[PDB]
Amino acid sequence: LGVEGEGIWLALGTIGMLLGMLYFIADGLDVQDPRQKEFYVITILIPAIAAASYLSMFFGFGLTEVSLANGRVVDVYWARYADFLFTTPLLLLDIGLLAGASQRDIGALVGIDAFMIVTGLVATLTKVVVARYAFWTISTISMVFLLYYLVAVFGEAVSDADEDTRSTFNALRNIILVTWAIYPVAWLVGTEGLALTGLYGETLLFMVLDLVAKVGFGFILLRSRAIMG
Amino acid sequence: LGVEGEGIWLALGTIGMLLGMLYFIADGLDVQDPRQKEFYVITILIPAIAAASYLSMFFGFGLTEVSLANGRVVDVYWARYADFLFTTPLLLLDIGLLAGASQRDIGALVGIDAFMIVTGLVATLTKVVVARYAFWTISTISMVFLLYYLVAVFGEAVSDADEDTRSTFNALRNIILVTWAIYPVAWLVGTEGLALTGLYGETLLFMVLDLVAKVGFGFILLRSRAIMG
Ligand SMILES: CCCCCCCC/C=C\CCCCCCCC(=O)OC[C@H](O)CO
Ligand SMILES: CCCCCCCC/C=C\CCCCCCCC(=O)OC[C@H](O)CO
Ligand SMILES: CCCCCCCC/C=C\CCCCCCCC(=O)OC[C@H](O)CO
Ligand SMILES: *C/C=C(C)/C=C/C=C(C)/C=C/C1=C(C)CCCC1(C)C
Ligand SMILES: *C/C=C(C)/C=C/C=C(C)/C=C/C1=C(C)CCCC1(C)C
């Protein structure tokens, strides 16, 4: 299933996201506190979007071909990018609200994030080889500014909170730092880049990163005392 | 010895380089073949430059302080970068000549290498924290292009040679791939970056990488039948 058997990872991704979503829905039933309810809506939406993306890729809706200037043809799962465009801002929104960061601060970070994702999409769609890597590079650079500001700006914002909140912040921050940094690598090593691995390994890698960065993150956030329970 | 005891590694580094150099000088006494003599000159120079660098660091000549924008002070062994500027191109020259790569091909790679090292130095010197990581990233990116071209371009160039040469090429190539890739990590984790380890462990790690990448590499190259023609 798929082009070279990567269907299994799409199915598992769909399953992981679907069940992560339902779990988050279930745990949010009791909640009436408006702030806590916002956290829930955000964190439910993240795996929902990802579920829809995974589901569509599994059936082949989010897949296209790109002929490069050097003749090589790349299978591009563009739905991934549609996923990223929406879920990563929500993720920043989630940790922002937890951090007590200002609307200005969150917006700024969402901007950089959008640049990151879109530049990535541009990199993936470009048929000129050097340009692919130039876009990928620009994107990776902007990811660094993003991660830096997450640490410095969101970190500053949370610093007046109690030890429990700051501790949850650091844990989520660390999930972002580690897993987000691997995304550009996955692209570099997979079929969109150097093609050191095929579609099968690339999809597996994205699936793990996706599950950790969304379901795992969501889990840590919703079970924290910081969101009031 | 040093800021926190790392003097021992500087001494050992100096010693390793010095004796690797002398070993290479000794083995080169017999050689008259002009090609083989070039390999010798290049490979002797590498540990000589590194010896000088280690020696100067040991006495404290290659050490400076950098106040960051956030107040933190970094002890920077800048001599390391002066070392890298000269030795890494010579290393590329060494494997290039063995590979039968054209002068244009070697030049191109030396260019990327110089970009790598200088961007690294810039990363290490910058007082603006974001910029540190952005430069580190750009450097690491260019290292990837370097290693890619080493594998693809030098690999192509050697492909018409006999199995013995190709085999020596792969071994040297593999030493570069493995050990060079650790350098940015050492920086990331050490006092110049996240500071998860201190000067003592950083210096030890640099020392091992340096000894393998220079003395070990040199040894493998000079004892090969490939250079003896
Ligand atoms: C280039 C040629 C391609 C051929 C065209 C075939 C049509 C594909 C359509 C949909 C599946 C992929 C879209 C799924 C996107 C991820 C989920 C998502 O974004 O869901 C909506 C979201 O809630 C909004 O904010
Ligand atoms: C193989 C292809 C290469 C792919 C390229 C991936 C590079 C992205 C990784 C890390 C960037 C660092 C961003 C994190 C910024 C650190 C913020 C900071 O200030 O950290 C210091 C800390 O305060 C003191 O411990
Ligand atoms: C492959 C190479 C690996 C070799 C690695 C060698 C590690 C150093 C060994 C022993 C002394 C450190 C043990 C003590 C713990 C460090 C902090 C400390 O208090 O050090 C006291 C020091 O001996 C001042 O009196
Ligand atoms: C649930 C999805 C998550 C957490 C996605 C994160 C995605 C990225 C951080 C993507 C980064 C990329 C680059 C920095 C370079 C170009 C390719 C990208 C888009 C994969
Ligand atoms: C004898 C010394 C050798 C072979 C050194 C090689 C050095 C590198 C490949 C260094 C790479 C770095 C980065 C990719 C970014 C951070 C700073 C550097 C310069 C350590």
Contact by Cβ (8 Å): A123, A64? no
Q: How far are the Cα atoms of B119, B136, B172, B176 from residue B143, in angstroms, in the given order?
A: 11, 10, 17, 11
d(CA A98, CA A95): 5
Cβ-defined contact of B137 to A133 (cutoff 8 Å): no
The closest alpha carbon to A58, from A4, A11, A12, belongs to A11
- CATH number of this structure's domain B7-111+144-227: 1.20.1070.10
At A65, which helix (H) or strand (E)? strand A63-67
Contact by Cβ (8 Å): B66, B74? yes
Residue of B nearest to A146 (CA): B130
Tokens 């914002």 belong to residue: A157
d(CA B98, CA B226): 7
User: What is the Å distance from ligand 3's center to B200 Cα?
Assistant: 9
Experimental determination technique: X-ray
Fold of A7-227: Rhopdopsin 7-helix transmembrane proteins (1.20.1070)
CA of B159 vs chain A CAs: smallest distance (Å) = 20
CA of B134 vs chain A CAs: smallest distance (Å) = 6
At A166, which helix (H) or strand (E)? helix A163-180
Contact by Cβ (8 Å): B216, B18? no
The closest alpha carbon to B96, from B146, B145, B32, belongs to B146
What burial class does residue A13 get, using C-beta atoms within 10 Å of its C-beta: 0-12 exposed, 13-18 middle, 19+ buried?
buried
Within an 8 Å CB–CB cutoff, is residue B137 touching chain A?
Answer: yes
Q: Which residues pair with B63 in a beta bridge?
A: B77
Using an 8 Å CB-CB cutoff, list chain A residues near B130.
144-145, 148-149, 152
B 146-185: CB under 8 A from A = 148
Contact by Cβ (8 Å): A43, A218? yes
d(CA B7, CA B19): 18
SS (H, E, C) B43-107: HHHHHHHHHHHHHHHHHCCCEEEEECCCCCEEEEECHHHHHHHHHHHHHHHHHHHHHCCCHHHHH
Domain range list for chain B: 7-111+144-227
Task: Tell me the one-letter amino acid at A203.
Answer: T
Chain breaks in chain B (C to N over 2.5 A) after: none
- The helix/strand/coil state of A32 is coil
Task: Name all residues whose Cβ lies below 6 A of ligand 5.
Answer: B 50, 84, 87-88, 91, 116-117, 120, 123, 136, 139-140, 143, 180, 183-184, 187, 210, 213-214
d(CA B144, CA A169): 33
Torsion on CA atoms B28, B33, B85, B214, rounded to nearest 10: -40
d(CA B119, CA A82): 34
d(CA A23, CA B172): 52
User: What is the Å distance from ligand 1's center to A52 Cα?
Assistant: 8
Q: Which residues pair with B65 in a beta bridge?
A: B75
DSSP string, A77-142: ETHHHHHHHHHHHHHHHHHHHHHT--HHHHHHHHHHHHHHHHHHHHHHH--SHHHHHHHHHHHHHH
Computed from CA positions of residues B192, B195, B200, B201, in that sequence, does the dihedral angle turn out positive or negative?
negative
d(CA A2, CA A6): 6
Tokens 């691997």 belong to residue: A182
Token pair belonging to A138? 């620009």
CA of B188 vs chain A CAs: smallest distance (Å) = 13
A188 lines ligand 2 (CB under 6 A): yes
d(CA B109, CA B92): 7
Token pair belonging to A20? 């992560």
The closest alpha carbon to A98, from A227, A228, A202, belongs to A227
d(CA B117, CA A73): 35
The closest alpha carbon to A139, from A114, A160, A163, A162, belongs to A114
At residue B101, what are phi and psi to the nearest 5 degrees?
Answer: -75, 145
At residue B164, what are phi and psi to the nearest 5 degrees?
Answer: -60, -50
Contact by Cβ (8 Å): A164, A220? no
The closest alpha carbon to B5, from B67, B79, B83, B58, belongs to B58
Q: How far are the Cα atoms of A5, A84, A125, A136, A201 from residue A72, in angstroms, in the given order?
A: 20, 26, 13, 18, 19
The closest alpha carbon to B123, from B202, B70, B165, B184, belongs to B184
- The helix/strand/coil state of A64 is strand
What is the separation, in whole angstroms, between the first and last Cα of chain A? 42
Contact by Cβ (8 Å): A54, A14? yes
Q: Which residues pair with A76 in a beta bridge?
A: A64
- What's the DSSP call for residue A68? -
- The helix/strand/coil state of A63 is strand
The closest alpha carbon to A114, from A88, A152, A79, A77, belongs to A88
Contacts (Cβ under 8 Å, ≥6 apart) of B189: B196, B197, B202
Q: How many residues does chain A have?
A: 229
At A228, which helix (H) or strand (E)? none
Largest Cα–Cα separation, chain B: 58
Token pair belonging to B109? 């790679």
Contact by Cβ (8 Å): A43, A24? yes
Q: How far are the Cα atoms of A139, A181, A193, B173 from residue A185, in angstroms, in the given order?
A: 12, 7, 9, 21
The closest alpha carbon to B91, from B189, B183, B185, belongs to B183
d(CA A188, CA B47): 34
Among A137, A140, A148, beta carbon nearest to B130? A148
- The helix/strand/coil state of B5 is coil
Number of Cβ within 10 Å of residue A76's Cβ equals: 18
- The helix/strand/coil state of A76 is strand
